[PDB]
From a paper:
The transporter P-glycoprotein (P-gp; ABCB1; EC 3.6.3.44) is expressed in the intestines, liver, kidney and blood–brain barrier, and affects the bioavailability, pharmacokinetics and efficacy of drugs. P-gp belongs to a superfamily of ATP-binding cassette (ABC) transporters found throughout all kingdoms of life. The transporter consists of two pseudosymmetric halves encoded into a single polypeptide. Each half is formed by six transmembrane helices (TMs) and one cytosolic nucleotide-binding domain (NBD) along with interconnecting loops and short helices.
Here, we report higher resolution (3.4–3.8 Å) structures of P-gp bound to a series of rationally engineered selenium-labelled cyclopeptide compounds that were designed to probe the ligand-binding pocket of P-gp. The R groups of this series were systematically varied to generate alanine-, valine-, leucine- and phenylalanine-derived compounds (QZ-Ala, QZ-Val, QZ-Leu and QZ-Phe, respectively) of increasing R-group size and hydrophobicity. All four compounds also prevented P-gp-mediated export of the anticancer drug colchicine and sensitized CR1R12 cells in a dose-dependent manner. Fitting the data to the Hill equation gave Hill coefficients of >1 in each case, suggesting positive cooperativity for their binding to at least two sites. In previous structures of apo mouse P-gp, and also for ligands pertaining to subset B, TM4 adopts a mostly straight-helical conformation characterized by weaker electron density, indicative of regional flexibility. Here, we only demonstrate two distinct changes in TM4 (kinked or straight helical) caused by two different subsets of ligands. In doing so, we reveal how drug substrates (i) may enter the transporter, (ii) bind at multiple, shared yet discrete sites in the transmembrane domain (TMD) and (iii) might transmit this information to the NBDs to stimulate ATP hydrolysis. Together, these new structures provide snapshots of how structurally similar ligands, differing only in side-chain R-group size, can bind prior to drug efflux.
Residue numbers in the entry:
A (entry chain B): 1 to 6
B (entry chain A): 30 to 626, 689 to 1278
The structure:
Amino acid sequence: XLXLXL
Amino acid sequence: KPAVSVLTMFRYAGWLDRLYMLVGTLAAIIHGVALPLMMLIFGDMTDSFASVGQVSKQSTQMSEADKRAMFAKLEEEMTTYAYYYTGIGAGVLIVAYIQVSFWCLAAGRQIHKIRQKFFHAIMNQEIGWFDVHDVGELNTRLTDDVSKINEGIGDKIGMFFQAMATFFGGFIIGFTRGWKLTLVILAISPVLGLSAGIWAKILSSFTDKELHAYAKAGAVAEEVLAAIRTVIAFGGQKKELERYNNNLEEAKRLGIKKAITANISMGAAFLLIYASYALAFWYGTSLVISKEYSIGQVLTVFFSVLIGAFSVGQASPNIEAFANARGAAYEVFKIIDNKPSIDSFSKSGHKPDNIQGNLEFKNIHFSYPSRKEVQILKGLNLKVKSGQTVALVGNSGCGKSTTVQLMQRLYDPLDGMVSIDGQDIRTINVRYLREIIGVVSQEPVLFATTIAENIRYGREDVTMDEIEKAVKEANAYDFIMKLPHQFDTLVGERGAQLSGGQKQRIAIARALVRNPKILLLDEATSALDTESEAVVQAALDKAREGRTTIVIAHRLSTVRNADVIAGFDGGVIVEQGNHDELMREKGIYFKLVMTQTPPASFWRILKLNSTEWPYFVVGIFCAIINGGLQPAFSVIFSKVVGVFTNGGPPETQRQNSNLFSLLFLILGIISFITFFLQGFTFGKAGEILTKRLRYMVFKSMLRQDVSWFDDPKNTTGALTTRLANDAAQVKGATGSRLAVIFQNIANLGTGIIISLIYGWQLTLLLLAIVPIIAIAGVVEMKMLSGQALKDKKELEGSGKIATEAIENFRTVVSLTREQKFETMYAQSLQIPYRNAMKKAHVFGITFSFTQAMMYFSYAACFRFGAYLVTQQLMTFENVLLVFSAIVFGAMAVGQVSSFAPDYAKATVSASHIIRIIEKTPEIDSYSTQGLKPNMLEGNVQFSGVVFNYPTRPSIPVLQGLSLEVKKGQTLALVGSSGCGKSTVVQLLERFYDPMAGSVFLDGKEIKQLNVQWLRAQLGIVSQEPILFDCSIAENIAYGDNSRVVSYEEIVRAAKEANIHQFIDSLPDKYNTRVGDKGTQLSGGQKQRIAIARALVRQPHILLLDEATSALDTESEKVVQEALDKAREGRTCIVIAHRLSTIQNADLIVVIQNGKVKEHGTHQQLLAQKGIYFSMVSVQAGAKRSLE
């Protein structure tokens, strides 16, 4: 959700 | 630049406002702290599943036994955590609402006061202050700056403190849960900073090079399109198209290089981000295997720290928002804090009774605020007795008006004093002074409201009776009563535009209601029709007789009855007395007396891109693999924490986290390959079609005829702009955006497939929640724009009454009643004020609802994730996977909404670019059709021609014009004026086919004749010849295309044109550059070069259009000599304005109103007496004068 994938 | 003291800015905040700000910023800081606490619990949840996850897999013996303790631990723990989350939700709801509502409230409450105080401050300024300032800038300054301030003192502050609160709150948990990882992150923090800087430096490079790159083509396009008639005449269209195509060819190469580098860089940045975070997490695991940290703690500090880290960046924009507001407030508070000398809002000074109105001006020196540059009044002395009427006269400088200007105390004089009655004007109250003085000005102004109201601006307290008597005493009653609506009739700039005299009369009525003791009339009679002048004059004469008066005008009809007349010279009073005395004086007065006695949306643009079947499939397949690659990181991060959470026996863990962390990076590097690809393929694909479009557009733009190029709709700049923009815009749609969209739908697709196939009814649950909060997100923004648009409409009405007030101000100050505009401004403001109160209420609810929904969503996530799903055999590692996958997929879908306008704009831009191609002319030069006659010798038959220019089909240039000129003889064409002479040349070139009539050359109609071949036989020479930038040999060689002209040939042409003196003199000689890029020349040379260009073609028809027009002295002689040598071997038509040089011509023809009037050889037209004799006789007079 930050930038990788969460 | 300039800011304001932080405390001064808030000066209008007191009591409830400061309270609102306190509770608001408090609640904001709480709201800020709220989030990182959410990630703190997220670690505790992980530990709960981790403890069970380990014990569950550690057994491998008993099953049922694990159905008891584990489920109980999960029961109590998950219930606790869910309870907490549900707890946080209400909190963020409340604090969010409080924050936004309170801060918006304070903002509104203040801005109201700011506006009122500011406008008052505007109205309170003395005229000397207006004289030195722009009123437009000032009103715009009001309307814009107050808004800036509002943006600054608004909820942005709350967001700022909330952000700082997330920052501190994030780093605090980050540190306290553990110190190491933080410090380890704060190292890659700069590393991240360096890559962003590099990327910025790369963006700055190509911006400049791109401007340089296309300007190479744009320069060609501009000189060509500006030269369009010369390239059309000489038919070099193919060449110009070739050049443009070459420049495009270069541009695209620079474009693909651009793309390559940009893509490499982006990929590299992405790689560094991947590497750094993967590395940090690996270090995390390396710390967990030591049993130094908990698997959940790592997550807690990682997420908390990154949250806090990004908080800064997210915080920064509100700083600038507050910072600008201080600055906007500076110049705003500067007016409010400014106390004038004059005031007039002050209650002070004597308000005398029984004023007998004796005025005097004593030794007054004055200058307007142009200051030392000019002093208009040097000394002065004047008296006007009570009841008398003095009339001021003067030649210029309007030192006359200055006295009217000073008598109202609009200014205080530099030295001297103006005295009404015995007292100094400065002792008596300003308002009262403005009230005892009536004023009538040259240009009367009427505020927009009923006539009564305009007469009511004389005095607030009045009855329709007084209005009636007022207008009747001004004799305006009749004219207005005949008007509909009676006294309720509208006036203003908008609607009911009336006669100047009537308006003036209404102004005299308005002034009359004022019942002034002192009357000032400045050129009220002047600048008006003579008939109504007497009508208004009667009123003016009736406006007196109760009062003492100073009058100024240029009308000496009105001066005679005056008791005293006063002349001025250089600001110095000289002559004074009765008329007869001034006439006996025979001075200035006597002197002046004697002196005065198409939409669309379609893919054919894409079908053009279909030229490349490849370069797309590659990019999309690549971008879809990228889209398939994107969630794979989620799957890893799930199983890294997942296997570690599901680890069971620890021995096997440390080996796997190394296998994942490796792979974690492996998807990174492979991302570099794909991301660069899809970027490069789309890029190179972009730059090529950009060539095809600009090429097809430009080409088809050289197809269009002169009729299209004269259009005011199409000019060189507009064409170049339309040429650049559309092609530039279609690139953006067909470019990166599409790739990204495919990448994102692919991303969410693979994501949702994974999430769906793993989680059962988990995904189904989420897909119910996610769209609702998304749509709930979108509906908010709609209300925001709605309230925004509505508010703009309400203050526009208040700004409209402000503009009316400060534009006509010098009138309102004279009538006083500024307090009127104050009140009206206030009432106008009152409505937006109540609207701004509702705004806070709404902004809060909408915001908080969108926070609470996201937090409450997060509760149902783990509550359904746990309990029903985890009481089942479904696992935490999958939950963690689904959330990541899904939510990121959505956050990828966001870019779809973000990229929406590009296609619209590109479509509007793609609409024109097809139309401009598909448009065909009446006369196209590209048609290979036409006769191409084999017979050389030319004639020209003009027979019954009628012509109107397509741009201006009003005044016809040609009507039934008919001419004949045999071969090898000069046709001289004389005319009164206009293009009637030139239209011949323009039509023979066939820039236009005439409305009616016809024109032949060899006896064949040029209309059915080939256009190019036709133009190919023509020797056109215009007034100011345009030469393109290139060798003068190339300029001369332009005379003939489809073939290269020999050197000795252009030499012969240059020898014929007598330009050879210049060409052999230059260092570069024939290779010398001309056209202002490399060299400068005078008219003579350029013209001789145009002659060479003309006759290198060896035309059978020379056309000389006013060739000597701009030229002088011997230049005319030598150029005329050249032109004279040029003709006599060819048919030609000479319209030149020097008739003395036409004196030798085979046939002279005078044109009149489009019909040939006079005809025949010089001595014949000279034998006859008529127009041509007058043409030649009149221009001989100038020569005789010069002699």
